[PDB]
Design an enzyme around this catalytic site. Sequence first.
Site, PDB file in Angstrom:
ATOM      1  CD  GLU A  35      12.266  71.214  58.274  1.00  0.00           C
ATOM      2  OE1 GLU A  35      13.469  70.941  58.444  1.00  0.00           O
ATOM      3  OE2 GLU A  35      11.426  70.311  58.133  1.00  0.00           O
ATOM      4  CG  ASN A  46      19.527  64.546  55.329  1.00  0.00           C
ATOM      5  OD1 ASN A  46      19.064  65.159  56.272  1.00  0.00           O
ATOM      6  ND2 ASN A  46      19.317  64.893  54.076  1.00  0.00           N
ATOM      7  CG  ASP A  48      20.369  59.969  52.422  1.00  0.00           C
ATOM      8  OD1 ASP A  48      20.862  61.083  52.752  1.00  0.00           O
ATOM      9  OD2 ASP A  48      19.328  59.898  51.721  1.00  0.00           O
ATOM     10  CB  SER A  50      20.956  63.841  50.744  1.00  0.00           C
ATOM     11  OG  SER A  50      20.256  63.443  51.912  1.00  0.00           O
ATOM     12  CG  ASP A  52      17.947  68.173  54.819  1.00  0.00           C
ATOM     13  OD1 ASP A  52      17.565  67.545  53.808  1.00  0.00           O
ATOM     14  OD2 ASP A  52      18.275  67.646  55.912  1.00  0.00           O
ATOM     15  CG  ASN A  59      17.018  65.514  51.176  1.00  0.00           C
ATOM     16  OD1 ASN A  59      18.113  65.406  50.728  1.00  0.00           O
ATOM     17  ND2 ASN A  59      16.457  64.556  51.930  1.00  0.00           N
ATOM     18  CG  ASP A 101       6.052  65.155  46.395  1.00  0.00           C
ATOM     19  OD1 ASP A 101       5.197  65.212  47.322  1.00  0.00           O
ATOM     20  OD2 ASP A 101       7.225  64.773  46.594  1.00  0.00           O
TER      21      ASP A 101
END
Length: 129
Positions: A35, A46, A48, A50, A52, A59, A101
């Site tokens: 990562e 990213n 969209d 957003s 990280d 994110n 989650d």
Amino acid sequence: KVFGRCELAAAMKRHGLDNYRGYSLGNWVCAAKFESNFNTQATNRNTDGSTDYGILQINSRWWCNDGRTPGSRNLCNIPCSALLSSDITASVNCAKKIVSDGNGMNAWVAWRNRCKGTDVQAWIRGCRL
Ligand SMILES: [Br-]
Ligand SMILES: [Br-]
Ligand SMILES: [Br-]
Ligand SMILES: [Br-]
Ligand SMILES: [Br-]
Ligand SMILES: [Br-]
Ligand SMILES: [Br-]
Ligand code: NA
């Protein structure tokens, strides 16, 4: 801060990440390697809008607030900048919520594509633990 491999392994173990939700320590170290290359200051935008943040590339779409991701949530209740600290506590605590989650470590696309199914114990071999 750029961590050493075994230094980060020790830090993750001390914060209770070893075997958390059934994922052995090597799975976490491998995910951090691909990562961020073990760099707490890593950031990546990213498509969209957003971003990280940090050693595990958490994110802003869901997990932290950076002031510029309209419509997003802040489920870890934290400013994204806290995920860039030389101290990994905030990243670890947020990663524990993320891996709980429903989808496990498939939340991290790099883990699925580069760690899952491999010899992840290699990532902690030789470390004094
Ligand atoms: Br390495
Ligand atoms: Br926002
Ligand atoms: Br901006
Ligand atoms: Br929220
Ligand atoms: Br630390
Ligand atoms: Br799972
Ligand atoms: Br392991
Ligand atoms: Na957010």
